[PDB]
Amino acid sequence: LGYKIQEYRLTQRLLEANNSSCIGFEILDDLRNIVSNHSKDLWKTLSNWMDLIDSGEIDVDNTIFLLFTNKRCHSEVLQLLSTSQATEEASKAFDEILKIVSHPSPSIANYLNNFSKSKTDACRLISKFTYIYGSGSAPHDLRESYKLHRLGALEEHLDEIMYEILGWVSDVLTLAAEKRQPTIVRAKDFGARLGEIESKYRQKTILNYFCNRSSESEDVQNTIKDAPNYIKQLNLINVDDSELEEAAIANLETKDAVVEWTLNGDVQDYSYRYYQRELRRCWGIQKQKIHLDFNGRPETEVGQRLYIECLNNVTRYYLENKKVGDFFAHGTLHSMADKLTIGWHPEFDKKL
Amino acid sequence: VSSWLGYKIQEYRLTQRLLEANNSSCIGFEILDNIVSNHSKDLWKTLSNWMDLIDSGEIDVDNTIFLLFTNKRCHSEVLQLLSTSQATEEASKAFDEILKIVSHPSPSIANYLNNFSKSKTDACRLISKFTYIYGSGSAPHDLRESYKLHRLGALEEHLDEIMYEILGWVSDVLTLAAEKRQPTIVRAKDFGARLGEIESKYRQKTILNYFCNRSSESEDVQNTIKDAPNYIKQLNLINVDDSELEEAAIANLETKDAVVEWTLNGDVQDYSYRYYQRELRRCWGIQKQKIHLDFNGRPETEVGQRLYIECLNNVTRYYLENKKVGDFFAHGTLHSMADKLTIGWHPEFDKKLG
Amino acid sequence: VSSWLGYKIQEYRLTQRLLEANNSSCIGFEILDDLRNIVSNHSKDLWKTLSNWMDLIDSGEIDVDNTIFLLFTNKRCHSEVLQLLSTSQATEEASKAFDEILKIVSHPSPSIANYLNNFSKSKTDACRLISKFTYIYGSGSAPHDLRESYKLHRLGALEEHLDEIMYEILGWVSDVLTLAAEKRQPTIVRAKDFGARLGEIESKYRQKTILNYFCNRSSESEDVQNTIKDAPNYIKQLNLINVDDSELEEAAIANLETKDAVVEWTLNGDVQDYSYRYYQRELRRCWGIQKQKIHLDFNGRPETEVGQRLYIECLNNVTRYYLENKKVGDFFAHGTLHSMADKLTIGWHPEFDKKL
Amino acid sequence: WLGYKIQEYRLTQRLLEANNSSCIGFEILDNIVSNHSKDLWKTLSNWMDLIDSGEIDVDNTIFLLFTNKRCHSEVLQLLSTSQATEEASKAFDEILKIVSHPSPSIANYLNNFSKSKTDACRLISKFTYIYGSGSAPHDLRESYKLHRLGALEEHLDEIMYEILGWVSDVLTLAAEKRQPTIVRAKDFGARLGEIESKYRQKTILNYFCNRSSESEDVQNTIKDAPNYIKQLNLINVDDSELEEAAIANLETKDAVVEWTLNGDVQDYSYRYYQRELRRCWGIQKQKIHLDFNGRPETEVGQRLYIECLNNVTRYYLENKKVGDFFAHGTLHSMADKLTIGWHPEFDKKL
């Protein structure tokens, strides 16, 4: 609780951020009231923050600062620091130095003297910095924020994504805590880690479809008598009707799997059109190969050989760099031939 | 941004607004195409059917930003009223103000006004979400800026090829909603699921990716055929048809450009193409002896064509740095070899051509 | 509150303690989930496990020297009244702690008092049960304690598949804890059988199919021509079918590149036993099938031509095989074919075992 | 593994009993407690002055001093007391009273005393020595059995011959002359991971096929003549050919029932059986009868037998590969049920 709810809030304010802002945490106030008027640790953190500003490595325009005490702490200037946001500050006047300070307890005067001396660090920092209490419900709030803000947020692997991103945030906070340099965690590194975490689980090399059809189904038996324009091409090559059942099965399962895989975001229309270009080239190779080898034969025999050689060869192709079953590669050839694109018969162009 | 996709202006502005929402449904446009005034015909048929979808439970008015697009902005006091009115007091004051402007309309559009005036609380909720945008010249440049700033984890290395795919997904939705005249519905949950899968494709280093778009009608393929280089001549000794010449000139150009792109990106290394070519030359050495054994007696062109087809079938299976390459790479590498006269198809290609 | 993996809290707090133990120390585990502070001196559920814990000592199957005993409450069941057993690690202090329990037991159970009658009969042995039993509670942040102890205590911990190793190893502990709970056997877990399971998940999730070897030897090399002029048995086998000199040179290149990589790089990424001697058997079956196909298809020719076609068919076929599920290049397959052809095991000529 | 230097078994034993964190080990010099050449007191603060100089891991480094000989003194035993909070802090003030060698010849740098005079670690770190005895091969062999979760006693070398090779290089080839050993225990266990995985893996995925022409459960299968053996009798195969048909059916029969007990495959499979391999057989049935005509009938059945055998080793089993025995053995499992046939007249005969 003391160490675990200090990284839910940084993740919750990093998830609701752009791809350019750098958010700096402070991991302060480990214990009267925790936040007093002349809080030496708060002025030390302010001095370190502004010394990080004049170092030149950190942008001032798009950097958000925070304070985390996980307690109300009942202070007036702490509420003033939590409050005056951009513009605001009653009516403007960002030159609000020595307001209700009045030089208390001059033991370490260097922090307030350096804060009052500088003019570029006593002015847009407070309007961008806000202070937030603990209010522990943060494993629920961050879980809601991930599914609300992140486009394409995975919900099945929700706990296995949200664990190592908190581990990365904890590792960054700890490694920046040993070196004593605040924390200059940027949203670009957080975004790269989140993208790698999601793309680890978004890896797949086989697209699975449940081939539960059969030769005795109603829709398979209708297409033989309906005769669409791929069954019509097989009727000139004198193939037996035993092939025409799984010819109609593979065509019906190719259209049923295209709409299934598209709706899950796996494939789209460009990827199936590329897959309908790779198999179209494969038909062009075996077309001239069979005419080369089996020359001087009747066209019923040559037309049958082109169907068999194109069935044993198109099974090696991939869709979205993923392996597909034999039903998809067999059935796409018929769905090519439906709009008269490829032909098993050598004279299918002027006969259909 | 890939400006070339079959580009339209209406697809950039949808994708920018889709990539600014928070996991909530976006209605999208109806293409209203100053002809659009307070008295208008094509405007009121668009808003009339929108009232039926609210009461049917198809969409919820709370988690929906309502948005319409015109290619050129039209000056109309009715249309600018709902674009600024997003509060409760603005929506209530605009229902009477609009109806006092379009009072006593034409009977062809009075039925559209009757469907809009069927309720009060449901009518003002559509006003409170309605926003009106217009086209701009810098439409693809705003998409590159919005991708690299709103997206935690934007890939800054192939985002010219990522955004070809995600614009074509939006293009496929808008085309599908235009073939059958049904109003568009696109959900940001389904938008990000394809967006999360395009970004996860260009992150795995085990796969070799290339944007395959050259075709037979391109200028480079015709110029390469008419230039007559070394590999087209070797294709011409064995007397192939023009289609094989076209596909050879296609495959060689995409193989060379893929070699250049993958070398200047960091995916493949420098010392892999030579080992790939040693593998393919060993394969050609096997198939030469095989075809010369199996085709004794037949003329030289038949043996050469048989060897070409056998090599075209066989050299696909090879790997480039243990990564899977496509058909175009393994088919254009043979022609790049034939450019340097390493491998050949004719049995006496060295004697016939110098 | 930490993120989870999808297992119950009775397995995250057992696998953490099972990882911390030695290789010769068993763990007895029990679950107390009867249920506010409900547990007291008269709750018979604690003495139900205690009677079972005591007659197992008389069984002798469980060693009594070094075995740690555990009972688990699924949440913090607070204000434990038998905590003197847990908070005592000294055997000399456990002697007076045994009769301290007997002071607070007083009157036994009215009808199930046999749990306590067998308890007060082995006092000298029961002092060993004091230091070997400790109270364990549901920590709340259960998966952020087993994952952290894996990254600290286990030597050679893999950080690449750590979230997926952790899924499988808790599956074995859940198999022991739950599938052996439908029948009420003695719920003991030996730590020697932990490391067989953990040493197989770690070993299986370390192999890789990037078996690779940079083949730099070319035709312009003195060892290739030296092996050609030397003429070993496989070169003599190639000479029976009158092969060209270029194929002879590539055969010598493949043989040297396979002989320099079969075992020479610390057995490569494989083992000698039943990987190469299985690869050789697969290639011999492949040669037999191709010999049948060649001698069946082209009936009637001079024997050099059918030998050459058998060589080319074997060359085109044997490149598909794997060396214990790894992708292996063509030079290895051709060199393995020539190495088996060296020992007269497979031959291209139809009369290769008679002429030589 | 037994024959090497005796100052090697103590190094790997201490690294064996350690965590993955606190993974820095230090080992360094080979009555001699303060001699003229000072080659035991060169190290004692100069080598860990790099802790103050700005090196990493300054709180979890464990040192080793003695190598083979047992020597008795007062300063070393006073500094090597218990490592408690108050006990370590009082060591350095007690050191300077009983030094018995305050000469600047051995205090060449002389700046460490002032520096190290601050508390505990700051003045006195955790310098502890362990000397080598004659049973240091026996102590390594016993501790690897006790502490390593998964010690391989099957191979009988106990995974210490090859880790003796790796731990010899850090002392010899990585000493870097006058430099600390500074051995990291993170890659010590990683190097232990490769040697352990090299010999533990006996079986990986496939069942060990041992049935090969040894004439039991294979030659016994031929004589009683089952269905798939009977199909090869009409096509007139040789006597050698029937052996691997009976061989490949037997290991296929063991592998189908063994894989489902361990939850590798399911009965929601056998889509590999009849959806794919029967469709594979159907295409090769029509391919043989197309081009190979005008031939004897018994030649056709072996022709389809060969083309089925070269093609069925492509289909995966629940997105996993299978061996050559499975695809050539499942082709006889359905021929046992007369699903397929090598001869065209496989229905009217049997």
From TrEMBL, chain A:
Pfam (any one): CTD7
Residue ranges constituting the ABC-three component systems C-terminal domain according to the UniProt record: 230-351
Name of the protein in its database record: ABC-three component systems C-terminal domain-containing protein
UniProtKB/TrEMBL annotation, chain D:
ABC-three component systems C-terminal domain ranges (all copies): 228-349
Protein name: ABC-three component systems C-terminal domain-containing protein
